[PDB]
């Protein structure tokens, strides 16, 4: 940016940090308004043989539910809907502020 | 022993040991009134035996939490008092009888 | 059918709900007409109250007179807690909608509706 | 491999299903059906009187502990007798899984309010009741939470209008806003897209 | 008396002589296909409607076989989907691109089976096929380059309004539908070709270009020029 | 539980407007299948949808107008019993148009052969 | 993982204890925060000289509507209606018949742009580039009626900003 | 090409022009009627036409990627040009 070295001193100081590291208004930094064109890949799909939708069709491999017990139609243990949900770890990079 | 549970408006309580097995034991008391054949009974007896026997066997709290998988302690002492709450209801409920009643004939046919 | 009742058992007790909601609807129009500064007379209040309830007495259904009087218990609350503006309360008797033709020749004049 | 088709998760479908049985085991009298669909989703139907005990037993059982209800709202199916269709969609925390409750009701059958066993059930059982027009029996306070004051008609019903039938604009003559009849400078322009050729031969229908 | 044979395993009771594709409507499957219609003879040219059979080491055109006794029709089946997808790679590589400037738009079975039956991309690396387009009166509009060659026109107009103008010359790949000279089809039968034509070969001239079918409300109404009623 | 006999009526409920309900017959109907395509899909289940009503052109830009909310309604039932029931209960009049489904045919590819008979192709 | 944002307890140590009580009695920390604005009070405005500088855009960016045309002048657009299949507001009305020479174009294309959401999916079901989503921005009326725009208005809008329109596609029509 | 009506209103590229006797014709009082001048119509026809020799021809508009669908024109009837109907562009085969 532009400040005199008194300014830039006493905004620091009054910070407490170094502002002209990090600086909130771009100067030159950033992309140029103009790029060179660019060229994007297709995808796996675009190949000219062993390339049949049959065989890549997501919504054709949708089922009905699955009926698990309908009314209409040894000791069992007893279950859960999932196993249980581990403990998380406290953070190693900062387990406290 | 320690300061805090982390949860708020829970308690760490002093003597887990004891109250674990207190509500263990209510719990298999209210569990006798159910009849025999009844599903709900048979499970939650054979999860309730299945904590019983832990807590009796652990002397260590940290120990004990990490056999039960239930979080913390005082979170395993109120998951055993919802669960004599639900106990008493279900006794009170009676969910074991045969289907109230059937649906009509396409009240879940879907698409429709 | 054995159908659940909602509140009442009998068309009855549907009558007696809908006797205690008129009163609770009748003692609170002056309470309106003050509170709301509306500039209808007590009067007027009570006759749109009257027949707001009698355009629903051809109803033979607990079930509906049951929920018709929730209804109307909901729209007095509305009133006294002065939830609603004075724009509801004039909204219900159409001010400016102009008087819609009955008569057959008059329809036929007017337009293609039935 | 197969890049563009989403993978399966054969153990959560197992242990979804597991569960299920258990649940329509410990609760005969009420479950009337359990699904589990194939991206792993949990559904149990359930008799309408047992949404108390049902969600109960669903909240407090030590095997599931659904504490949070994440969802709670309704399907209007005009074909049925009974045409709305209450859904509760439950979260466990303790064992990171979620469930889905489904009941059925009509206009005139209220439902019991689930604000004993879950607070959130509060609003959104106000909700249901403005937007549907189901009646939910022991609700602390159940009136309108969207709609308007005073408005007519519950507006999610299939049968509905989208643009309802009365519309506000201001009357100078009278210095307030006046409700009138609906009137569009434009009417909405209905589009039929189905396309008369069958799609998925998956959940082709029987001839009947 | 009744035979029993099997779509995708479920038993049907048809009659002899009823075809493959019959059958499957039976139960309820409706077969692709362009050159078929249930009104017209069975011509069989387009080999869209080709479908397994359980134990036939080749598919079989199922608007024209007639059902056997024990036979298990497999409509969904790997050599049914790869025969759809083959046949409908092969139409829409000599069809023009012009379906934003085409009448039969969102009402195109071409379109329609190519989004349910075939593939979502193109192999056709070549140059396509231009037709010279033919005049046959103020009523039809004829654009020959989306013909498909299905003669379905061909033969509703012999077979239905008893006129023989309509046919086929050249053959091969250039192989046209037409009069072969300036002669209008003028019959009191002539829409019916606009509706039967799958492809936007044969467009309404007085409806062109005006709406789009999903656009359109439709009204179940009768025809008052005459007292047949339609 | 209590036991009441009477035909279900809820139109007192539905806040429609008494001309909307009183003046409206419904159609409940098969759609016919269109025309200009071959596939049935869309036959398949039945349609309720209300009369036409009155559209006029806007004085500025010339667009269609309508004053009646029930235009663009159309409604999906699976059975002419349900649409009958739906409609009886709503309180609206209602014509019923009974299923159209085409007729079993005898179609034959040796018939474009025929020795004797007029069923003989002149062309393929 | 997770981390406690608030779990720490301060030393009772007298030194700290001392400066705690200083901070209690001296305002150290609302010092503190006048160190802060005075140092932004300091640094430089991040403001821009309206209407004479403008933020910055991009080639993708969607204003105002326009209806081009080819080199030779003909428009671009053959009434096919996809644009008013897809737009989600229901904001475009076309009407098409015939042309003089037999072309298929339009004589009604009409745009309410107080029902436009400006979600730039007409120029994306657009098969030919006739619709396009301009740069403009600054269109702002002072009647409703002068927000409906029509045939000629679309047409004038291309024919005014075709240069821009032409370099934004230029820049952006490898990306799509 | 602009046309005028014998009401003095500018005739549109679609020859909409309000009757004399039209109400409507009162909302351009002190103000203006949005006409383009351009007419597509005329430019088209002003466009030449090309002659290639060759029974089919390819038209995308120009551009490629940037024009319409590529289609493809039969220069067979030697009594017309062939037209491509997106972008309207006449093409023909060299005669005599
Ligand atoms: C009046 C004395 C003469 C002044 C100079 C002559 C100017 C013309 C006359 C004044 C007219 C107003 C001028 C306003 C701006 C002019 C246009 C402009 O922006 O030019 C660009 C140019 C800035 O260049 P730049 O390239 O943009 O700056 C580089 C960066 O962008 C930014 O880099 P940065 O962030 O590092 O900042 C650079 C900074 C770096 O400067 C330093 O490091 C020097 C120390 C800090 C500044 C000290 C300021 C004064 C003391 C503190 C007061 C609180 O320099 C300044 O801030 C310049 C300060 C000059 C002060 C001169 C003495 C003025 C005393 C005013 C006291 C008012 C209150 C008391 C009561 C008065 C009663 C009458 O302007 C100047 O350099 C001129 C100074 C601007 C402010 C002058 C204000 C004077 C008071 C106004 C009224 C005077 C008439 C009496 C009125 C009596 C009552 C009716
Ligand atoms: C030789 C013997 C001499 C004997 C005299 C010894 C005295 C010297 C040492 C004691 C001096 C103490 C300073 C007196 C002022 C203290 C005020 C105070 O009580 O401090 C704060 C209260 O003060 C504030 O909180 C200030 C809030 C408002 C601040 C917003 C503006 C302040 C920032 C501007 C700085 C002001 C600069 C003053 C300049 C004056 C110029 C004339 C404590 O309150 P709490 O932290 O909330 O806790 C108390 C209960 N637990
Ligand atoms: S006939 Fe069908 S596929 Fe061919 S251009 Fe027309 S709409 Fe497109
Ligand atoms: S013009 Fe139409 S109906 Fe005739 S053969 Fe071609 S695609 Fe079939
Ligand atoms: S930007 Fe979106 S809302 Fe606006 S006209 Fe285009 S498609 Fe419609
Ligand atoms: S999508 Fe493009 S070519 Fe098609 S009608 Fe709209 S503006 Fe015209
Ligand atoms: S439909 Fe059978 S081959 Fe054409
Ligand atoms: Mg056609
Ligand atoms: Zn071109």
Redesign the pocket.
């Known amino acids: 940016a532009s400040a005199t070295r008194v300014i830039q001193l006493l905004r620091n100081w009054a910070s407490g940090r170094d502002l002209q590291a990090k600086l909130q208004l771009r100067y030159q930094e950033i992309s140029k308004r103009t790029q060179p064109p660019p060229k994007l890949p297709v995808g796996p799909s675009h190949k000219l043989s062993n390339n049949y939708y049959c065989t890549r069709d997501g919504r054709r491999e949708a089922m009905p539910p699955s009926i698990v017990m309908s009314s209409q139609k040894t000791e069992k243990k007893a279950v859960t809907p999932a196993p249980p949900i581990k403990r998380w770890e406290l953070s190693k990079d900062q387990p406290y502020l | 022993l320690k300061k805090t549970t982390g949860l708020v408006g829970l308690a760490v309580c002093e003597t887990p040991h004891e109250r674990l097995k207190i509500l263990y034991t209510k719990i298999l008391d209210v569990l006798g009134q159910i009849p025999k054949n009844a599903a709900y009974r048979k499970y939650t007896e054979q999860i309730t035996n299945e904590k019983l026997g832990m807590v009796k066997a652990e002397p260590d709290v940290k120990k004990l939490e990490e056999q039960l998988q239930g979080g913390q302690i005082e979170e395993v002492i109120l998951q055993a008092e919802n669960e004599l709450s639900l106990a008493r209801k279900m006794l009170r409920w009676k969910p074991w009888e045969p289907l109230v009643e059937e649906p009509p004939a396409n009240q879940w046919k879907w698409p429709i | 059918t054995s159908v659940k009742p909602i509140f009442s058992r009998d068309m009855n007790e549907a009558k007696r709900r809908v006797r205690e909601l008129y009163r609770a609807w009748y003692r609170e129009v002056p309470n309106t007409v003050h509170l709301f500064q509306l500039d209808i007379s007590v009067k007027q209040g009570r006759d749109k109250v009257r027949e707001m309830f009698m355009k629903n007495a051809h109803v033979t259904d607990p079930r509906v007179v049951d929920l018709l009087v929730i209804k109307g218990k909901m729209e007095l609350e509305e009133t006294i807690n002065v939830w609603k503006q004075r724009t509801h309360i004039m909204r219900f008797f159409h001010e400016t909608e102009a008087p819609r033709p009955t008569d057959f020749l008059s329809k036929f004049y007017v337009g293609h509706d039935p | 491999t197969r890049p563009t088709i989403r993978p399966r998760n054969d153990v959560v479908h197992k242990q979804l299903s597991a569960f299920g049985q258990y649940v329509a085991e410990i609760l005969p009298k009420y479950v009337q059906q359990v699904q589990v669909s194939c991206f792993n989703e949990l559904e149990i139907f359930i008799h309408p009187d047992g949404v108390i005990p049902v969600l109960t037993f669903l909240r407090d059982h030590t095997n599931a502990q659904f504490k949070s209800l994440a969802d709670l709202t309704a399907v209007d199916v005009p074909t049925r007798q009974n045409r709305f269709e209450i859904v509760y969609n439950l979260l466990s925390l303790r064992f990171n899984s979620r469930i889905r409750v489904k009941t059925y009701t009509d206009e005139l059958t209220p439902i019991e309010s689930s604000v004993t066993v879950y607070k959130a059930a509060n609003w959104y059982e106000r909700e249901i009741w403005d937007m549907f027009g189901v009646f939910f029996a022991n609700h602390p306070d159940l009136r309108r939470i969207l709609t308007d004051y005073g408005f007519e008609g519950h507006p999610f019903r299939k049968d509905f209008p989208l643009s309802g039938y009365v519309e506000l604009r201001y009357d100078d003559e009278v210095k307030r806003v006046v409700a009138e009849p609906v009137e569009l400078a434009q009417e909405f322009r209905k589009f039929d897209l189905n396309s008369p050729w069958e799609a998925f031969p998956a959940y082709r229908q029987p001839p009947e | 008396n009744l035979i029993e044979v099997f779509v995708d395993g479920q038993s049907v009771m048809v009659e002899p002589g009823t075809t493959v594709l019959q059958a499957c409507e039976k139960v309820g499957m409706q077969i692709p296909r362009f050159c078929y219609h249930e009104r017209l003879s069975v011509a069989g040219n387009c080999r869209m409607c080709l479908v397994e059979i359980e134990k036939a080491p080749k598919v079989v055109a199922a608007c024209a076989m007639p059902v056997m006794k024990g036979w298990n029709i497999l409509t969904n089946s790997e050599k049914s989907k790869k025969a759809r997808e083959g046949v409908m790679e092969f139409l829409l590589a000599n069809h023009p691109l012009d379906c934003?400037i085409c009448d039969q738009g969102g009402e195109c079975d071409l379109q329609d089976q190519s989004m349910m039956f075939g593939s979502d991309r193109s192999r056709f690396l070549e140059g396509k096929r231009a037709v010279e387009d033919k005049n046959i009166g103020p009523l039809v509009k004829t654009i020959m380059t989306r013909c498909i060659q299905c003669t379905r026109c061909i033969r509703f107009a012999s077979e239905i309004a008893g006129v023989d103008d309509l046919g086929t010359t050249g053959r091969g790949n250039d192989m046209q539908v037409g009069t072969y000279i300036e002669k209008m089809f003028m019959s009191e039968l002539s829409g019916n070709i606009i509706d039967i034509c799958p492809v936007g070969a044969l467009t309404s001239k007085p409806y062109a270009f005006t709406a789009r079918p999903w656009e359109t409300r439709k009204t179940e109404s009768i025809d008052v020029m005459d007292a047949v009623g339609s | 539980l209590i036991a009441v006999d009477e035909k279900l009526d809820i139109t007192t409920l539905t806040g429609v407007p008494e001309e909307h309900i009183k003046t409206r017959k419904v159609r409940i109907f098969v759609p016919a299948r269109n025309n200009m395509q071959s596939g049935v899909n869309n036959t398949k289940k039945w349609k309720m949808e209300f009369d036409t009503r009155e559209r006029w052109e806007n004085p500025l830009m010339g667009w269609s107008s309508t004053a009646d909310p029930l235009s663009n309604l159309v409604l999906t039932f699976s059975t002419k019993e349900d649409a009958v029931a739906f409609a009886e209960k709503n309180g609206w009049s209602f014509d019923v148009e009974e299923r159209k489904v085409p007729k079993p045919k005898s179609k034959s590819y040796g018939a474009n052969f025929s020795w004797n008979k007029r069923t003989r192709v002149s062309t393929k | 993982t997770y981390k406690f944002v608030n779990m720490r307890e301060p030393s009772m140590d007298m030194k700290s204890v001392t400066d705690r009580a200083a901070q209690t009695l001296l305002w150290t920390e609302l010092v503190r925060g006048l160190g802060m604005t005075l140092s932004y009070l300091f640094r430089e405005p991040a403001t821009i000289n309206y209407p004479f500088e403008k933020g910055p855009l991009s080639p993708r960016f969607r204003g105002e509507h326009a209806?081009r045309r080819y080199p030779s002048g003909e428009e671009?657009?053959?009434?096919?209606?996809?644009?008013?299949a897809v737009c989600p507001a229901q904001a475009?009305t076309?009407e098409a018949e015939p042309r003089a020479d037999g072309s298929r174009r339009?004589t009604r294309?009409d745009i309410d742009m107080t029902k436009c959401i400006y979600c730039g999916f007409?120029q994306e079901?657009?098969?030919?580039d006739?619709?396009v989503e301009g740069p403009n921005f600054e269109f702002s009326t002072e009647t409703h009626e002068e927000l409906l725009y029509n045939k000629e208005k679309l047409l004038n809008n291309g024919d005014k900003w075709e240069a821009e329109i032409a370099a934004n596609i230029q820049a952006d029509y490898l990306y799509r | 090409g602009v046309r005028t009506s014998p009401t003095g209103e500018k005739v549109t590229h679609t020859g909409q022009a309000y009757d004399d006797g039209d109400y409507r014709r009162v909302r351009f009082s002190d103000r203006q009627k949005e006409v383009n001048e351009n007419f597509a119509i005329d430019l088209i026809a002003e466009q030449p036409v090309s002659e290639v020799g060759s029974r089919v021809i390819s038209c995308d508009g120009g551009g490629g990627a940037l024009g319409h669908p590529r289609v493809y024109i039969n220069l067979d009837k030697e009594t017309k040009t062939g037209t491509c109907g997106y972008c309207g562009l006449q093409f023909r085969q060299p005669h005599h």
Request: hydrophobic share 45%.
């Open positions: 934003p | 209806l671009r657009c053959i009434a096919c209606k996809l644009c008013e475009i076309i339009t294309y007409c079901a657009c098969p030919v006739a619709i």
